[PDB]
Design an enzyme around this catalytic site. Structure first.
Site, mmCIF file in Angstrom:
data_model
loop_
_atom_site.group_PDB
_atom_site.id
_atom_site.type_symbol
_atom_site.label_atom_id
_atom_site.label_comp_id
_atom_site.label_asym_id
_atom_site.label_seq_id
_atom_site.Cartn_x
_atom_site.Cartn_y
_atom_site.Cartn_z
ATOM 1 N N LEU A 1 17.117 6.269 -19.190
ATOM 2 C CA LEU A 1 16.478 7.332 -18.417
ATOM 3 C C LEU A 1 16.173 8.582 -19.240
ATOM 4 O O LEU A 1 15.236 9.320 -18.933
ATOM 5 C CB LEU A 1 17.306 7.682 -17.173
ATOM 6 N N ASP B 1 25.898 25.547 -16.533
ATOM 7 C CA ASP B 1 24.768 25.204 -17.392
ATOM 8 C C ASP B 1 23.535 24.893 -16.556
ATOM 9 O O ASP B 1 22.731 24.030 -16.907
ATOM 10 C CB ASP B 1 25.100 24.012 -18.289
ATOM 11 N N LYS C 1 20.055 24.689 -14.916
ATOM 12 C CA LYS C 1 18.689 24.910 -15.388
ATOM 13 C C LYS C 1 17.722 23.950 -14.694
ATOM 14 O O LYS C 1 18.153 23.010 -14.030
ATOM 15 C CB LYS C 1 18.601 24.803 -16.920
ATOM 16 N N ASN D 1 18.220 20.305 -14.582
ATOM 17 C CA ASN D 1 19.349 19.877 -13.759
ATOM 18 C C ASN D 1 18.927 19.625 -12.309
ATOM 19 O O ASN D 1 19.749 19.252 -11.472
ATOM 20 C CB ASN D 1 20.489 20.896 -13.794
ATOM 21 N N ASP E 1 24.882 17.272 -12.913
ATOM 22 C CA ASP E 1 25.773 17.811 -13.955
ATOM 23 C C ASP E 1 26.828 18.832 -13.501
ATOM 24 O O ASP E 1 27.518 19.428 -14.330
ATOM 25 C CB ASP E 1 24.981 18.322 -15.170
ATOM 26 N N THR F 1 18.355 26.256 -23.002
ATOM 27 C CA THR F 1 19.520 26.737 -22.267
ATOM 28 C C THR F 1 19.605 28.258 -22.231
ATOM 29 O O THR F 1 20.034 28.837 -21.231
ATOM 30 C CB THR F 1 20.844 26.183 -22.851
ATOM 31 N N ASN G 1 23.167 -17.120 -49.009
ATOM 32 C CA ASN G 1 22.381 -18.108 -49.741
ATOM 33 C C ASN G 1 21.359 -17.442 -50.661
ATOM 34 O O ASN G 1 20.701 -18.104 -51.463
ATOM 35 C CB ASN G 1 21.715 -19.110 -48.794
ATOM 36 N N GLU H 1 11.260 -7.409 -42.639
ATOM 37 C CA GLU H 1 10.276 -7.268 -41.571
ATOM 38 C C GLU H 1 10.942 -6.986 -40.226
ATOM 39 O O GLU H 1 10.443 -6.200 -39.421
ATOM 40 C CB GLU H 1 9.401 -8.518 -41.468
ATOM 41 N N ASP I 1 -1.830 20.318 -25.380
ATOM 42 C CA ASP I 1 -3.195 20.645 -25.766
ATOM 43 C C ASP I 1 -4.087 20.562 -24.533
ATOM 44 O O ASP I 1 -4.909 19.655 -24.404
ATOM 45 C CB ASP I 1 -3.655 19.681 -26.856
ATOM 46 N N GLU J 1 0.710 29.048 -31.612
ATOM 47 C CA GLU J 1 1.416 27.996 -30.899
ATOM 48 C C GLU J 1 2.518 27.334 -31.730
ATOM 49 O O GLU J 1 3.623 27.105 -31.239
ATOM 50 C CB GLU J 1 0.435 26.950 -30.358
HETATM 51 N N1 LIG Z 1 21.811 10.153 -11.454
HETATM 52 C C1 LIG Z 1 20.581 10.431 -12.130
HETATM 53 N N2 LIG Z 1 19.432 9.959 -11.599
HETATM 54 C C2 LIG Z 1 18.246 10.198 -12.187
HETATM 55 N N3 LIG Z 1 18.169 10.914 -13.313
HETATM 56 C C3 LIG Z 1 19.306 11.422 -13.906
HETATM 57 C C4 LIG Z 1 20.551 11.207 -13.338
HETATM 58 C C5 LIG Z 1 21.485 11.879 -14.193
HETATM 59 C C6 LIG Z 1 22.976 11.980 -14.137
HETATM 60 C C7 LIG Z 1 23.632 12.466 -15.249
HETATM 61 C C8 LIG Z 1 25.013 12.564 -15.261
HETATM 62 C C9 LIG Z 1 25.768 12.171 -14.180
HETATM 63 O O1 LIG Z 1 27.138 12.263 -14.210
HETATM 64 C C10 LIG Z 1 27.632 13.369 -13.538
HETATM 65 C C11 LIG Z 1 26.821 14.203 -12.777
HETATM 66 C C12 LIG Z 1 27.379 15.298 -12.123
HETATM 67 C C13 LIG Z 1 28.737 15.558 -12.229
HETATM 68 C C14 LIG Z 1 29.547 14.728 -12.986
HETATM 69 C C15 LIG Z 1 28.992 13.636 -13.636
HETATM 70 C C16 LIG Z 1 25.126 11.671 -13.075
HETATM 71 C C17 LIG Z 1 23.736 11.573 -13.058
HETATM 72 C C18 LIG Z 1 20.762 12.451 -15.233
HETATM 73 N N4 LIG Z 1 19.460 12.179 -15.055
HETATM 74 C C19 LIG Z 1 18.410 12.618 -15.919
HETATM 75 C C20 LIG Z 1 18.494 12.206 -17.321
HETATM 76 C C21 LIG Z 1 17.428 13.004 -18.007
HETATM 77 C C22 LIG Z 1 16.403 13.325 -16.926
HETATM 78 C C23 LIG Z 1 16.973 12.757 -15.652
#
Ligand SMILES: Nc1ncnc2c1c(-c1ccc(Oc3ccccc3)cc1)cn2C1CCCC1
Length: 433
Positions: free
Chosen positions: A13, A130, A132, A135, A149, A168, A317, A354, A379, A390
């Site tokens: 992902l 964190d 953003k 997230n 997260d 960040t 070999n 290869e 672009d 840029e």
């Molecule tokens: N569950 C998800 N579904 C779709 N995309 C996801 C996730 C998650 C994800 C990441 C960590 C995770 O583990 C925790 C999340 C919150 C708290 C503790 C662990 C659960 C789902 C990330 N992404 C991202 C990756 C980069 C762009 C989309």
């Protein structure tokens, strides 16, 4: 319990905070899930095992429509596996940049969801830290937002690699930098996002990480930009309460929900803001893809040499040719099992020299196509070129020394603009090639 006893990998992902995320599937139920895999090598723990396990345990019990649902936790020698629900609507900002209109109503609807989720977690004593735009995933055009997260930054030290630090600085609350922070830091970050939603520009900006952090630490920002004229006073008022320097004087998540603006807006289209968000987003995604491209290239170079020395040792070999079973054992050796066999069969479907070439290209193109695509996205005039202005912005966000990339630009642009291939050459030069 073993993670691979229960789950199998399907697709990658992408890179997320503290680790890579894999779409995996239950071997029994066919239930699709998203898994964050955290390398104990790449990431230092900040807390003891007991505190982490307990947070995990609580997280499994928590439920909110705007918060990603966590199902499971695993740990082995080198990894943690955090398994939760998959969301398919992608990142909020990508959806936003592809809209005809965007108004204070849309922003209010977004913010309501974010705030509701934050409020819920703060009631349960959990801070994101964190927070953003990346997230913020969409569940499925009216689909609810799921915050990802939550709970990670308390137990794991933030990575120092620029690939992970990208973007960040804009969103981080000042008191987080100094070590004394609480749940209000999530309000600050949410304040910054709202500011961007309404103007398309971060309130604290700069040519590099430190310049931004410096603006953040100072705490000053304005609604001076012309486009703030088309924005209500109550929105700007809420931003002020959210972007209040001292956390004790800063509005809580809960009280923000009751604010005039949220009540009222849950009307013209902010076109300038959309144009700035699209530019902003493209820049961040290109800088990110660029850093990821260099990283994948080096990782590839490393693994290429390592895999060759293994395939050389296996050639008992001495002819330069090998069979399928040897390749499998070698590839397994590189990592030192069904996923390896499958990958091997895919490469073989497409002389070990290869093989190495194609195999690594098959990683060189996850990031090569992300790069080409982000370049074409950036672009927007379809001119095929990037300006020096840029470039400065991209490398500045990439934290690549201005003089170093200018140097590299000189060797390729012997003749004030670069095409995609030049840009890629620039990156090859910037990773020792
Ligand atoms: N569950 C998800 N579904 C779709 N995309 C996801 C996730 C998650 C994800 C990441 C960590 C995770 O583990 C925790 C999340 C919150 C708290 C503790 C662990 C659960 C789902 C990330 N992404 C991202 C990756 C980069 C762009 C989309």
């Amino acid at each position: 319990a073993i993670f691979s006893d229960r789950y199998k990998g399907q697709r990658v992902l992408g890179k997320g905070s503290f680790g890579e995320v894999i779409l995996c599937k239950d071997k029994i139920t066919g239930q699709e899930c998203a898994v964050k895999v955290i390398s104990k090598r790449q990431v230092k723990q900040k807390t003891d095992k007991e505190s982490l396990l307990r947070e995990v345990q609580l997280l499994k019990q928590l439920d909110h429509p705007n918060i990603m649902k966590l199902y499971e936790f695993f740990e082995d020698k080198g990894y943690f596996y955090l398994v939760g629900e998959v969301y398919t609507g992608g990142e909020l900002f990508d959806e936003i940049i592809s809209r005809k209109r965007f108004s204070e109503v849309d922003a209010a609807r977004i913010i309501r969801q974010v705030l509701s989720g934050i409020t819920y977690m703060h009631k349960n004593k959990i801070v994101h830290r964190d927070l953003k735009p990346e997230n913020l995933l969409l569940e499925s055009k009216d689909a609810n937002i799921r915050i990802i997260d939550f709970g990670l930054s308390t137990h794991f030290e933030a990575s120092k690699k620029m690939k992970d630090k990208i973007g960040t600085a804009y969103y981080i609350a000042p008191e987080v930098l100094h070590g004394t922070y609480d749940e209000k830091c999530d309000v600050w970050s949410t304040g910054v996002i709202l500011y961007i939603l309404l103007s398309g520009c971060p309130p604290f900006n700069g040519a590099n990480e430190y310049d931004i952090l410096k603006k953040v630490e100072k705490g000053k920002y304005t609604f001076e930009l012309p486009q703030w004229k088309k924005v209500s006073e109550s929105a700007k008022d809420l931003i002020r309460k959210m972007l209040t320097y001292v956390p004790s004087m800063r509005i809580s998540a809960r009280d923000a929900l009751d604010h005039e603006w949220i009540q009222t807006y849950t009307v013209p289209s902010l076109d300038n803001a959309i144009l700035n968000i699209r530019q902003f987003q493209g820049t961040q995604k290109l800088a990110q893809a660029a850093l990821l491209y260099m990283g994948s290239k080096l990782t590839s170079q490393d693994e290429t040499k390592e895999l060759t020395a293994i395939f050389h040792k296996m050639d008992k070999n001495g002819d330069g040719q090998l069979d399928r079973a040897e390749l499998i054992e070698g590839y397994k050796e590189l990592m030192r099992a069904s996923a390896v066999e499958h990958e091997v069969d895919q490469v073989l479907d497409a002389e070990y020299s290869e093989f190495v070439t194609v195999a690594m290209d098959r990683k060189t193109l996850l990031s090569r196509e992300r790069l080409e695509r982000a370049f074409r996205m950036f672009d927007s005039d379809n001119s095929g070129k990037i300006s020096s202005t840029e470039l400065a912005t991209i490398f500045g966000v990439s934290d690549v020394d201005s003089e170093t990339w200018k140097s590299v630009l000189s060797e390729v642009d012997k003749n004030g603009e670069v095409d995609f291939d030049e840009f890629q050459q620039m990156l090859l030069k910037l990773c020792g090639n």
